[PDB]
Design goal:
Two copies of one chain form a homodimer.
Chain A lengths: L1 E5 L4 H10 L4 E5 L13 H11 L3 E4 L8 H4 L1 H21 L3 E7 L22 H16 L3 E6 L2 E2 L6 H11 L2 E5 L3 E2 L2 E2 H17 L5 E4 L6 E2 H14 L8 E5 L19 H7 L6 H13 L4
Parallel strand pairs in A: 1-2, 1-3, 3-4, 4-5, 5-10, 6-9, 7-12
Antiparallel strand pairs in A: 8-11
Bound molecules: NADPH dihydro-nicotinamide-adenine-dinucleotide phosphate (2 copies) and magnesium ion (MG).
The site of one NADPH dihydro-nicotinamide-adenine-dinucleotide phosphate has 24 residues of chain A, from helix 1 and strand 4.
């Protein structure tokens, strides 16, 4: 049984090369895949590889994820987050393949306290959310064998991430200022990839689980609380920091082209009973990646 | 459903903290676990934590793995690779918990060409192999709900490994000399942990799969061929190397207290059909860890 993976070199995709490797025979691609087209710009191009490879499961981790630039390039985001998904969906339905795809909390507005469920109404605040919603609707309509996982604040230790950019500030700077009103749950690429591997194995035996799922680490926190923990662990690890005065702030204080949401809390009870899997507190994931980041030996 | 993991900070254990995290509620320990005894020296000590925690699945990645030192300290190896396993097995059988445990190719002699199967006869060449065999026999006899995975040449990117120590030589040195007659298959901690997570989920629904399994990346190579690939990829990555003359050698040329085997090839067909999982060629695993090692940004 063969698995096709697009977006191989992303945060989640890099971890999915690991997790999908024993599930089945894996073929992994990206934009610069030379011997197979993986550029989500050319949707009939990606679609022709689906038809030319004939996979049992397609896992799509390729996506336009520059939230702000998106507003200035709305049509390029549509192509990547909706046009090529529909294209890929339809081609998957020709051979009854499964399609696994990732979405976002930006499909919802911002109305604090309450965590958003699957049956809830959707009102996208910005373009990213708008385009990504379109993709999930295109998929749902064009292919009944799908698994949609909406996630949030996704990070990995390979490459750029929040913790990193903040630490880098904390080394170079003395007093920092970061948001305390956008609430959410940081989700590791490790967790998303690992859960995906098991959901695929269940899906294959129990078609009834097809559908849409909320999938994020447990708990709830803010960018501020988040950075406090990154500083706290840095210190405990013996990193020195030039930072000394940590200040919390409103959203309004910081410009941003795209409207960021206030309430990114997602209820994940559905995924839990449907797949019989645990979703751990966000803090474990972050401490783990921080510890791989700080234990740098060559 | 609760999972108990010993040997949390080892190569395989570090990756099992990741992989077992969604399978069930995880409790992870090591020697210095302060609020729970994880020191495999005190077998009634580890056993009391099994009884005091009451887990559905126990996964044992703690072990004495210093192959040579073992000959000079044979009784300390027995304690760690056999005494505490038996102790843990018996206590697991009190509550019908599963026990997942790791063994080795050193349970077999050395008689080239042919890859060793599960039904094959065992004749341990050194103490490590001897003690570890004892453990797997103690487990099989004391607990019918077990999964034994014999593996080989196990590596990880966190910490010390073969590739690393060789590169370090290749930077510092000009002509290197490494073995070409011990044949085997390098197996990643990533793969062992990932496969373990899925085998646990099958085991739980299908008790019939309990037993002993060979579990190693596919393919076959030698320490020399192995190092050639580590150098080849280093160069391709733009690392510079002071190495220029790579020479292959016999085993005899190098001293070693413990008798190392010649034929570490393991047939893994059993694990494959029994769990419906793919086992990928060793080269993927190694290239992946090399690429995480070489892409060092802070
Ligand atoms: N980061 C986050 O905060 C969130 C992510 N998600 C969802 O998770 C999934 C992946 O996110 P993540 O892996 O973290 O983000 P990444 O940006 O790491 O991954 C997206 C992938 O799309 C690739 N890509 C870019 N342009 C193209 C193109 N023209 N054709 C094909 N591939 C292209 C990207 O490569 P490159 O960057 O090198 O161009 C990258 O490989 C998506 O559904 C995403 O929306 C959801 C909510 C939040
Ligand atoms: N490395 C290899 O080539 C092979 C490994 N295996 C099997 O895989 C499994 C794990 O190997 P791997 O993870 O690679 O090896 P590691 O040495 O990385 O892991 C073994 C663990 O045992 C821990 N440990 C050491 N002493 C004690 C003690 N007194 N009480 C409790 N724990 C202790 C070790 O910690 P610390 O080192 O910090 O003391 C480490 O955490 C074992 O079955 C092993 O035999 C099999 C064949 C080959
Ligand atoms: Mg990793």
């Amino acid at each position: 049984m063969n698995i096709l993976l697009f977006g191989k070199t992303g945060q989640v995709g890099w971890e999915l090369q690991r997790s999908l490797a024993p599930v089945g025979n894996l073929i992994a691609l990206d934009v610069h895949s030379k011997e197979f087209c993986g550029d989500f710009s050319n949707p009939k191009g990606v679609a022709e590889t689906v038809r030319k490879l004939r996979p049992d499961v397609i896992v799509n981790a390729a996506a336009h994820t520059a939230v702000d630039k998106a507003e200035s390039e709305p049509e390029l985001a549509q192509l990547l987050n909706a046009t090529s998904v529909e294209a890929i969906a339809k081609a998957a339905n020709e051979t009854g393949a499964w399609v696994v795809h990732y979405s976002t909390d930006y499909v919802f507005p911002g109305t604090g306290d309450i965590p958003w469920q699957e049956t809830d109404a959707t009102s996208p605040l910005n373009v990213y959310g708008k385009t990504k919603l379109a993709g999930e609707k295109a998929l749902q309509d064009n292919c009944p064998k799908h698994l949609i996982f909406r996630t949030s604040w996704v990070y990995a230790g390979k490459g750029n991430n929040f913790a990193k950019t903040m630490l880098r500030l904390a080394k170079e700077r003395q007093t920092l200022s970061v948001i305390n009103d956008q609430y959410g749950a940081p989700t590791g690429a490790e967790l998303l990839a690992d859960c995906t591997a098991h959901a695929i194995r269940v899906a294959l035996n129990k078609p009834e689980v097809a559908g849409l799922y909320h999938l994020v680490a447990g708990g709830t926190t803010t960018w501020h609380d988040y950075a406090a923990l990154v500083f706290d662990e840095a210190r405990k690890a013996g990193i020195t920091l030039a930072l000394t005065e940590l200040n919390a702030v409103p959203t309004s204080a910081y410009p941003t082209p795209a409207s960021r949401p206030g309430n990114s809390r997602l209820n994940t009870e559905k995924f839990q009973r449907n797949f019989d899997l645990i979703l751990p507190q966000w803090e474990l994931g972050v401490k783990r990646m921080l510890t791989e980041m700080f234990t740098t030996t060559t």
